[PDB]
Amino acid sequence: VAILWHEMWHEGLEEASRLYFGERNVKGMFEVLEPLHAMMERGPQTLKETSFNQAYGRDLMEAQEWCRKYMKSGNVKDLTQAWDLYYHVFRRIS
Amino acid sequence: GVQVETISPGDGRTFPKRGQTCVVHYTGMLEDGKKFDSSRDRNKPFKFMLGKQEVIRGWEEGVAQMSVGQRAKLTISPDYAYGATGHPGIIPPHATLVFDVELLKLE
Numbered sequence A: 001v002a003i004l005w006h007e008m009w010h011e012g013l014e015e016a017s018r019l020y021f022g023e024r025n026v027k028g029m030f031e032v033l034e035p036l037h038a039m040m041e042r043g044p045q046t047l048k049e050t051s052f053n054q055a056y057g058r059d060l061m062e063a064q065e066w067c068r069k070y071m072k073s074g075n076v077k078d079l080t081q082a083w084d085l086y087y088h089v090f091r092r093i094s
Numbered sequence B: 001g002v003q004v005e006t007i008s009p010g011d012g013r014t015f016p017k018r019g020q021t022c023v024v025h026y027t028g029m030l031e032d033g034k035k036f037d038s039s040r041d042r043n044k045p046f047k048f049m050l051g052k053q054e055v056i057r058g059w060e061e062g063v064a065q066m067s068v069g070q071r072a073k074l075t076i077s078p079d080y081a082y083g084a085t086g087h088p089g090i091i092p093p094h095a096t097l098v099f100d101v102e103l104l105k106l107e
């Protein structure tokens, strides 16, 4: 499996937003987003991975802090804040 | 489903066309005026594409009818918004929404 980080995030955000906004399935939205973040955590290993991490790494790390805020708070406004940063990434990738 | 009332007129002749992106500013309120969201609070316009069910059906039918520069009040019944379920923590069940939206530009 060879896939650019640009692609895996565009598809992953699209799918996670469908589960969450369309299906009201928050468990399924996490299930999708956790492995994407865990790959950023491991670090870029190609030039194309590195430039994607340079442009979007900080926003995606901030979207993850909001999601983690929500885990502990139970307040859906913390998860919306994460979707504003995810959508800005998604639009930039698009 | 959606009632559209003009706040500030638009040109009357540039309407959104298939595959354009709409760039708007909006403020969303429940029926009694309680604000739940505003792009203007972020001072960052909201962009989306019509006709692809990206947004609730009130905006899809509402904003399609607007011309560039128009600002309008969209009053959207629950069936054209978030329905019996709402969006838990933000939009109650069976909620009529009122959005103030301004169509800034098409790109």
Ligand SMILES: CO[C@@H]1C[C@H](C[C@@H](C)[C@@H]2CC(=O)[C@H](C)/C=C(\C)[C@@H](O)[C@@H](OC)C(=O)[C@H](C)C[C@H](C)/C=C/C=C/C=C(\C)[C@H](c3ccc(C)s3)C[C@@H]3CC[C@@H](C)[C@@](O)(O3)C(=O)C(=O)N3CCCC[C@H]3C(=O)O2)CC[C@H]1O
Pocket: A013, A014, A017, A018, A021, A022, A023, A080, A081, A083, A084, A086, A087, A090, B028, B036, B037, B046, B048, B053, B054, B055, B056, B059, B087, B090, B091
């Ligand atoms: C999957 O079904 C679709 C679900 C969609 C859900 C409502 C909430 C839309 C959300 C959007 O407009 C975003 C841009 C579109 C989607 C999530 C979907 O179309 C999705 O479908 C697969 C998709 O294509 C997008 C582009 C993928 C991308 C990775 C995700 C972007 C998510 C963006 C979320 C944003 C901008 C919103 C934020 C605002 C401020 C923040 C901070 S975050 C979400 C919050 C959630 C809570 C509600 C009260 C609200 O405040 O919007 C709100 O003010 C609202 O009702 N909006 C946003 C403004 C347009 C009208 C309306 C709506 O239609 O939202 C409705 C139409 C259904 O067909």
